[PDB]
């Protein structure tokens with residue numbers, strides 16, 4: 041789970057490429073992106 | 089002295105042709121009954137509990153109202169429930185023939201004598217499943233509220249599915265709570281848990297507007313999603329909410345072929361035939377209560393026997409009989425579809441356990457996600 | 472800013488109690504008390520609800536001991552009803568009673584104690600006897616729920632037609648089973664009929680345990696109730712005044728929390744010509760359902776998902792020498808046995824074992840080719 | 846049968862052997878009305894007492 045805070049792409053990609061090049065049974069089930077620039081009255085964040 | 093006259097109060101609410109109604113209820117004089125109906129039409133503006141109770145009780149205090157034929161132009165099931173309550177407390181035969189009073193009410197009172205001119209929830213559900221068979225819509229989900237009858241609905245669907253060799257796929261069953269508010273976005277999530285292309289929605293029209301609104305907010309009202317609803321959802325075909333999705337299939341009453349004066353006449357015929365069948369099997373008729381204030385004292389003197397004669401009325405070659413739960417045994421149903429013009433159009437008919445649809449292939453919008461594919465019979469590739 | 476609370480109570484005295492509770496709520500927007508007493512019948516009761524209460528725009532209606540017409544009428548508008556003394560399970564059905572809460576638990580929740588009592592005594596095999604009405608079925612469903620929240624099982628469930636005076640068949644149906652622990656749910660007069668038949672059927676002596684609720688040890692049902700029976704009584708369950716006090720505190724708290732919000736509309740006034748629900752009704756209801764009052768006269772008042780009071784406390788009562796004796800209490804989740812010893816229905820004072828295995832076991836088989844030749 | 850004799854030998858109990866009222870073993874099926882799950886067969890007799 042990340043927000044739009046700078047770095048989040050570096051983070052997710054670092055994970056994805058550490059995983060990809062490994063002989064280990066890693067399993068990334070979900071990657072969420074949360075928009076903290078909007079209000080959360082539509083409960084989007086909650087549903088994520 | 090003389091053939092006894094029973095008091096049948098015909099209550100009409102809203103715009104209604106009293107002339108045509110009285111001309112179709114007094115013309116055909118019936119002499120095949122052991123009793124003659126004394127029809128007395130009464131009008132009423134409001135449909136609140138106090139107004140209905142007061143009007144009916146006063147109608148029973150003034151004249152000897154043996155039966156009460158009720159009709160309205162609204163879409164309030166609460167009317168039918170109130171009528172069931174009155175019919176339970178006063179043990180007075182009440183017939184909801186049109187409007188919200190005709191909207192089905194499940195689990196009526198034990199001593200209720202309130203019958204409705206409408207199909208049962210189980211029967212409507214069965215018709216829905218039959219429609220899903222006619223167009224091979226095997227994969228579907230069900231969304232019901234806490235409205236009385238959701239249990240009977242879902243259980244009917246399940247019972248029909250289990251004992252069938254048809255590959256039914258009941259993905260999700262949602263139980264939306266309308267008793268509380270929806271600020272926690274619970275309903276939104278429940279509806280978001282829907283995956284099926286066909287959704288069976290069971291609730292009130294007022295609730296249906298909200299549910300359709302939320303579903304539209306999620307994205308379940310557009311093309312690729314077909315909603316099917318009972319009668320109490322659509323209701324008045326001349327009143328369509330903006331929240332209702334275009335392509336909404338619904339099972340309703342054949343209001344075109346079954347007019348309001350015909351409904352009044354049939355109800356009067358039911359009460360009269362019941363009274364006659366009782367006066368020829370026990371030689372007496374329950375005395376009409378002239379007060380709603382003393383229905384607790386003369387409770388041991390009042391009976392619930394007319395039901396066994398009200399549940400079984402054959403008139404003019406038509407079987408206008410009811411059921412123990414308080415619904416019509418053999419109702420003439422009509423399958424209507426909401427078009428792009430936001431109007432209800434008859435696209436099917438249900439009669440005598442037979443389903444006759446208008447179109448062979450269901451008219452879906454030829455989008456860029458729908459293709460027509462041809463194949464040739466060749467074993468084992470195409471068997 | 473004036474928020475009316477309504478109430479249908481037993482007497483003018485309890486009316487004055489309601490009034491004083493409301494006055495106190497004001498002391499502790501300002502509330503005004505409006506109340507009436509019960510009408511002689513359901514129609515007059517509904518009409519009274521409209522003309523006397525809803526006519527004053529009540530946000531809620533307290534109801535004491537047939538609340539049904541009040542629940543229906545108020546629910547028409549989605550005006551919440553707070554039952555002060557009704558325990559019937561039918562008011563827990565959201566389908567029928569849309570906006571009904573109560574400061575007492577329904578009879579059927581006694582099953583939880585029964586369940587805890589089975590834990591309190593390691594009864595793994597039990598016979599259930601229920602009346603074939605709504606309350607009986609509610610109790611059955613609820614106990615089967617408690618039994619199948621932890622693998623526990625019902626050896627049999629018996630149902631009887633209410634008003635049946637000879638229940639010998641059913642009890643003979645219960646004699647044939649192994650389990651000697653017997654649980655009963657029935658009205659007063661039916662409790663009486665079962666107790667009578669049971670005794671005549673000699674099921675009240677050594678070996679048998681009888682576990683029951685409140686209705687089955689009340690009034691006339693006590694006159695013929697066997698000795699050593701274990702039963703329950705809802706603590707404070709009959710003090711209308713206390714429940715009025717607490718209901719008024721909870722409703723005042725809920726009113727103020729509700730008015731802590733925005734876009735609050737007033738409830739409907741007169742009935743005549745009004746057919747739309749109170750728009751703020753479901754939210755006010757949500758507020759009551761989730762209200763919390765820690766310092767209540769009757770203990771800790773909270774509501775569960777059905778709007779039934781939760782965390783109720785029960786006295787566990789034992790009939791000793793035809794006298795009702797308190798042998799314990801049920802708190803929230805745990806049974807507490809007091810210094811007074813339980814005298815069981817049967818021989819000695821030792822806790823019986825409801826698992827008397829029969830010497831004759833009817834073995835069943837089917838004609839199979841290599842195993843069972845017939 | 847011999848196995849039942851062995852069980853009766855190990856654990857002392859009197860037995861009243863009988864056959865199934867039908868011809869099946871024990872499978873769950875729907876009721877005639879109200880859709881109620883009811884087992885039919887040997888288990889249908891075992892659950893009914």
Ligand SMILES: *[C@@H]1O[C@H](CO)[C@@H](O[C@@H]2O[C@H](CO)[C@@H](O[C@@H]3O[C@H](CO[C@H]4O[C@H](CO)[C@@H](O)[C@H](O[C@H]5O[C@H](CO)[C@@H](O)[C@H](O)[C@@H]5O)[C@@H]4O)[C@@H](O)[C@H](O[C@H]4O[C@H](CO)[C@@H](O)[C@H](O)[C@@H]4O)[C@@H]3O)[C@H](O)[C@H]2NC(C)=O)[C@H](O)[C@H]1NC(C)=O
Nearest residue numbers: 635636637638639640641642643644664667668669671672
């Ligand atoms: C309270 O509850 C107790 C139960 O503990 C009651 O005792 C029970 O009473 C019933 C009724 O008398 C006893 O009867 C069993 O009844 C059936 C069916 O029929 C009876 O009812 C018929 C109408 O439905 C009626 O036509 C029958 O009469 C004809 O046939 C008999 C012969 O069967 C004949 O003698 C008559 O002259 C009639 O021609 C009959 O009255 C019956 O078939 C049962 O029988 C078999 O099994 C018994 C042994 O169980 C055996 O003795 C019989 O010969 C037969 O093989 C049986 O009689 C029932 O037995 C009673 N149960 C007990 C435990 O005593 C009690 O009456 C209730 N009292 C009150 C005040 O409520």
Ligand SMILES: *[C@@H]1O[C@H](CO)[C@@H](O[C@@H]2O[C@H](CO)[C@@H](O[C@@H]3O[C@H](CO[C@H]4O[C@H](CO)[C@@H](O)[C@H](O)[C@@H]4O)[C@@H](O)[C@H](O)[C@@H]3O)[C@H](O)[C@H]2NC(C)=O)[C@H](O)[C@H]1NC(C)=O
Nearest residue numbers: 587590591770771782784800801802803804805806807808
């Ligand atoms: C109503 O009276 C009840 C008395 O029967 C009260 O229940 C008791 O509450 C006390 C206080 O918490 C408990 O004592 C503590 O128990 C905890 C939990 O350990 C036990 O339970 C866990 C599972 O939750 C289990 O794994 C353990 O093996 C224990 O059995 C301990 O951690 C503490 O050290 C301490 O012992 C009692 O155990 C408990 N009694 C029973 C029978 O449950 C209840 O709190 C009262 N209610 C109110 C509102 O006061």
Ligand SMILES: C[C@@H]([C@H](O)c1ccc(O)cc1)N1CCC(Cc2ccccc2)CC1
Nearest residue numbers: 166169170173234235543544547566567569
């Ligand atoms: C409980 C609701 C209803 O069942 C319901 C509505 C919406 C739901 O989502 C779920 C349920 N009713 C109860 C009875 C009320 C009528 C009434 C009033 C006074 C006397 C007799 C009868 C009208 C509304």
Ligand SMILES: *[C@@H]1O[C@H](CO)[C@@H](O)[C@H](O)[C@H]1NC(C)=O
Nearest residue numbers: 102103130131132133134744
């Ligand atoms: C209400 O009823 C009265 C007579 O009963 C009628 O005059 C009046 O027009 C009605 N109200 C409306 C809005 O039509």
Ligand SMILES: *[C@@H]1O[C@H](CO)[C@@H](O)[C@H](O)[C@H]1NC(C)=O
Nearest residue numbers: 365396397399400401402409
């Ligand atoms: C209904 O009426 C018909 C008319 O003859 C009769 O034959 C039938 O028995 C009636 N049904 C019941 C259940 O009484």
Ligand SMILES: *[C@@H]1O[C@H](CO)[C@@H](O)[C@H](O)[C@H]1NC(C)=O
Nearest residue numbers: 707708709710711712713768
């Ligand atoms: C309520 O009644 C009970 C008696 O069972 C007792 O607590 C007292 O009499 C009353 N309590 C209050 C606070 O009035």
Ligand SMILES: *[C@@H]1O[C@H](CO)[C@@H](O)[C@H](O)[C@H]1NC(C)=O
Nearest residue numbers: 732733734735736737750751
């Ligand atoms: C409350 O807000 C809603 C909009 O979501 C709307 O009904 C209106 O703005 C407010 N209601 C009233 C009665 O002002």
Ligand SMILES: [W+6]
Nearest residue numbers: 497498499501
């Ligand atoms: W002040």
Ligand SMILES: [W+6]
Nearest residue numbers: 497498499501
């Ligand atoms: W002040």
Ligand SMILES: [W+6]
Nearest residue numbers: 497498500501
């Ligand atoms: W002040």
Ligand SMILES: [W+6]
Nearest residue numbers: 472497500501
């Ligand atoms: W001031």
